[PDB]
Design a protein around this ligand. Structure first.
Ligand SMILES: [Au+]
Ligand SMILES: [Au+]
Ligand SMILES: [Au+]
Ligand SMILES: [Au+]
Ligand SMILES: [Au+]
Ligand SMILES: [Au+]
Ligand SMILES: [Au+]
Ligand SMILES: [Au+]
Ligand SMILES: [Au+]
Ligand SMILES: [Au+]
Ligand SMILES: [Au+]
Ligand SMILES: [Au+]
Ligand SMILES: [Au+]
Ligand SMILES: [Au+]
Ligand SMILES: [Au+]
Ligand SMILES: [Au+]
Ligand SMILES: [Au+]
Ligand SMILES: [Au+]
Ligand SMILES: [Au+]
Ligand SMILES: [Au+]
Ligand SMILES: [Au+]
Ligand SMILES: [Au+]
Ligand SMILES: [Au+]
Ligand SMILES: [Au+]
Ligand SMILES: [Au+]
Ligand SMILES: [Au+]
Ligand SMILES: [Au+]
Ligand SMILES: [Au+]
Ligand SMILES: [Au+]
Ligand SMILES: [Au+]
Ligand SMILES: [Au+]
Ligand SMILES: [Au+]
Ligand SMILES: [Au+]
Ligand SMILES: [Au+]
Ligand SMILES: [Au+]
Ligand SMILES: [Au+]
Ligand SMILES: [Au+]
Ligand SMILES: [Au+]
Ligand SMILES: [Au+]
Ligand SMILES: [Au+]
Ligand SMILES: [Au+]
Ligand SMILES: [Au+]
Ligand SMILES: [Au+]
Ligand SMILES: [Au+]
Ligand SMILES: [Au+]
Lengths: 170, 170, 170, 170, 170
């Protein structure tokens, strides 16, 4: 037995966070293919979201690996379908993505608070090394996108949406 | 004599499909030079269509080569002049091109149905290997273009048409 | 609109098959991490299943891409949790995996039958090019593994399980 | 003692000009980070100003080095906070920057006049070699920017501001 | 004097932890040479433990270096002889090693708790950067070994012990 200073509460919260990252991965998968539709056709937006799907899956896998390293047991639940089947405009999609990220970030913060209360400094190191800063960086990038998309909706919404995709998402 | 399991009905349909691909080649030739007119001057659009002319000719030549491999006899008809002398806007031209492609695709599907009824699995392999998927891919790309062109016609049609050509057709 | 010769029945079946491949991906994800447990610790088995997770996800993504190419609409459902939380011996796990693969293969065959009834030769080409042969190859490899694992269970089950992992899964 | 033909009046004016260049450096530092705000998010503008911060600091350091070479004594004052905490639009910011540059340029000209009255040809060579032409070049570039930004404010101010940043500040 | 926010309690605990790492280094030194005995002769096991001796010494040296950086004073005690002169089977030895590691890990956790109570964030950063994760990784690897060794003791203990050494410790 390797397990040491690893609470059942942390263990459960880690499994839940795995589920959240995989669901976020699935949502980005859905976002990406929506933007590849022939009637939506924003290549840059598709690529931005499909790269996010991959990053979220890798996040989940790092959690799992850590679960195993600590002597916890991975438990998998259903992955709930994404919150929408169609994602509207690039603006709507980027808003949906930032809401999703802030929810992941809150989960990460709830898990740090749990780790601190349980006195689990390995867990806190883990999250600091691989999660907190990356999530902050992503959220800042999404905020930057949203600001640029918004400046580009004048009365020429189609034009702005094309330009953003061609000149930022490049 | 090499001919084996190659019906006179398939043979005729192959010659007809050759004629269709060559006519499509000629239409793209006309589309390309229209966009090179000094009073139209959309370089990217010219290059997109001239590359299509070449792909359609190569399609025809692969058919012919297969006709000969099976022991059929190539028979050539008049190539009808393209359906228009002037092709309007990039939008009009891309619509005309997608109609043309869907007609080629339907011909390809009619020839697969004929091959299946004649029990000609070489023919069906041929079309699968070199035609069905390529036609599907092209049609999807044209749908994507049309969607982007359409989003770019606000009330600034000239501006949109320039940007599409500069930033997509690149 | 690009959609041509693409039935609503094929479209639904493609979405279902996407769901099956993603669920199979999730099952392999669970299989892989079970074998990375400190109390199971079969590195080779973990790597075999984690590579399968990735192949199944890529399968799903190729389906989705094809869905979009044909003018279908991707629709995502819940991904059901894997059928087990713990997977027993390497033998048990490989049996579970071959059952899973035969179920995917049957789904692939049901979709070819549907494509043939709908007269959809693009769909049939798609499955032939990327799915049928790969699934057959994998199933044969799993059969080969199962045979070797089984020959290795004498009365020295632990020894056999170690050797298989060290000398085959390498 | 090395000091030769170096008036106390030149010496003081050099220290003042150091202070001006460092303050200009600090203003550009503030301009740069304002444009990196998530609610402003104009990467190109941030980079243009942060490069200016660095050039102004280097200007100051060349002055200081010359002060020491001539046997003067560097004296440092407070660096006053920048004139604004928020800098408005890219247009507003570029106007603020050109005003700042013209004030530095005037200081440079006042110091050449002082050097000529004191008969200090080393000082005049120094300013000619490293300051006068560089300041003129920068001011011309800022004038060019301002002209392009202004042409880009139609009634689509957001669009113009995005394009300038993407296609000029690149 | 450099010392700042560095308690006498942390300082003592750091010296104690140095002693623990050096003793662990000495124990691995003894484990390694036991496995090089002509009547034990398990090369792979010798190399695994001698590499551990080195890692534990380096751990000690990083502590010492940090002690000096913070203005603490290194104080050395006797290094107690290892707990055994002969270490039994590879299984016995790996069990002894995991007990040793869990004791080091507990010491590391006691020192983080002490650092948190003393409000010493440099100390906590230090341990996170170089100790907590490495200790967790090692313990997981030892758990994995133990599991494989245990599966290999059937009634053919000699055979299992040879195979583990040849095919894992490689
Ligand atoms: Au995508
Ligand atoms: Au994409
Ligand atoms: Au994708
Ligand atoms: Au924490
Ligand atoms: Au913490
Ligand atoms: Au903590
Ligand atoms: Au974003
Ligand atoms: Au975005
Ligand atoms: Au971006
Ligand atoms: Au052309
Ligand atoms: Au051309
Ligand atoms: Au041409
Ligand atoms: Au066919
Ligand atoms: Au066929
Ligand atoms: Au056929
Ligand atoms: Au097109
Ligand atoms: Au087009
Ligand atoms: Au294109
Ligand atoms: Au794995
Ligand atoms: Au693995
Ligand atoms: Au994995
Ligand atoms: Au089929
Ligand atoms: Au078929
Ligand atoms: Au078919
Ligand atoms: Au297998
Ligand atoms: Au297997
Ligand atoms: Au294998
Ligand atoms: Au900046
Ligand atoms: Au910047
Ligand atoms: Au900067
Ligand atoms: Au002068
Ligand atoms: Au002068
Ligand atoms: Au002068
Ligand atoms: Au400028
Ligand atoms: Au500027
Ligand atoms: Au510029
Ligand atoms: Au050794
Ligand atoms: Au050794
Ligand atoms: Au040694
Ligand atoms: Au701590
Ligand atoms: Au701490
Ligand atoms: Au601390
Ligand atoms: Au070990
Ligand atoms: Au070991
Ligand atoms: Au090992």
């Amino acid at each position: 037995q390797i397990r040491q200073n690893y609470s059942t509460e942390v263990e459960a919260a880690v499994n839940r966070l795995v589920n959240l990252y995989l669901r976020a991965s699935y949502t980005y998968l859905s976002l990406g293919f929506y933007f590849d539709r022939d009637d939506v056709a924003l290549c840059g937006v598709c690529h931005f979201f499909c790269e996010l799907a991959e990053e979220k899956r890798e996040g989940a896998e790092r959690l799992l690996k850590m679960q195993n390293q600590r002597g916890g047991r991975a438990l998998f639940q259903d992955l709930q379908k994404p919150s929408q089947d169609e994602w509207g405009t690039t603006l709507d999609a980027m808003k949906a993505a930032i809401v999703l990220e802030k929810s992941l970030n809150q989960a990460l913060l709830d898990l740090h608070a749990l780790g601190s209360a349980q006195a689990d400094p390995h867990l806190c190191d883990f999250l600091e090394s691989h999660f907190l800063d990356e999530e902050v960086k992503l959220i800042k990038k999404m905020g930057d996108h949203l600001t640029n998309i918004q400046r580009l909706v004048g009365s020429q919404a189609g034009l702005g949406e094309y330009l953003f995709e061609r000149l930022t998402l490049k």
